[PDB]
Amino acid sequence: AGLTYSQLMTLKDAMLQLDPNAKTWMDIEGRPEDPVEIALYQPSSGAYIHFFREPTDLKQFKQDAKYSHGIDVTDLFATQPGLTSAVIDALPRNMVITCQGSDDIRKLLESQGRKDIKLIDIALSKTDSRKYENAVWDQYKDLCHMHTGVVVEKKKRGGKEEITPHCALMDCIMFDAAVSGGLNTSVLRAVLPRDMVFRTSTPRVVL
Ligand SMILES: [Mg+2]
Ligand SMILES: [Zn+2]
Known part of the structure; x- marks a missing residue:
């Protein structure tokens, strides 16, 4: 139903890589x-936490896919169940998290019992x-491949137009650049091991 004991201990050690x-x-x-x-991102070190989850509500997911993230739902079937709750449980206590544009992060953390985490609201x-x-995607596109669909925006006076998909990791990077007043070239590093973020490794077909 969730993470094994091995996995939770690996996750606990990985969380030590975040500077609280x-x-x-x-x-x-x-x-x-x-x-x-x-996604969680510490620009000082370049360390990032990044993972995916299968949605519960497919109707809302399909609208989010068309207007925001463009993720194909079948690419989410091999995710590790319970990882979101496990990661949020494991975040350092009383840490300060910066977020942009909305109260979604507040509502997610609060729903998981992490009201100790203080939030800086960048407006x-x-x-x-x-x-x-564009510069962030050009420097870092190979860090996230999951935004495969066409994403559109409703236009000011009616109609639609294609836009770049919205990725949680790219958002962290580009928001920090916009608040910092510049985009650094920095080697980034994944905190979670790749074996933890996706589930099944058994060949479905012999070829
Ligand atoms: Mg977002
Ligand atoms: Zn992404």
């Missing part, structure tokens, strides 16, 4: 009661928040 007093960004795709992509306008969007 350094700046930490957090962002999600999907609704706070039903997230499908979660960047949507336009300013994405000033480094």
Whole structure:
């Protein structure tokens, strides 16, 4: 139903790689009661937590896919169940998390019993928040491949137009760049081992 004992101990050790007093960004795709992509990012070290979750509500997921993240739902079937709750349980106590644009992070953490985590609300306008969007994707696109669908936005006077998909990890990186006043070239490093974020490794077909 969730993570094994081996896995929870690995996760506890991985969490030691977060500096509890350094700046930490957090962002999600999907609704706070039903997230499908979660990222945490410490720009000082370049360390990031990043993983995915299968949605419970498929109707809301399909609308989020068309207007936000473009994730194909079948790419989420091999995710590790219970990882979101396990990661949130494991975050350092009383740490300060920075988030942009909405109270989604607050509502996710509170729903999981982490009211100790203090949140800095950056009120960047949507336009300013994405000033480094293209540069971040160009530097880091190979860190997240999951945004495969066409994503659209409703236009000011009617109609639609294609936009770049919204990724929780790229968002953390580009939001920090916009608040910092510049995009650094930095080697980033995944905190979670790759064997923890995706589930099944048994060949479905012999070829
Ligand atoms: Mg987001
Ligand atoms: Zn992504």
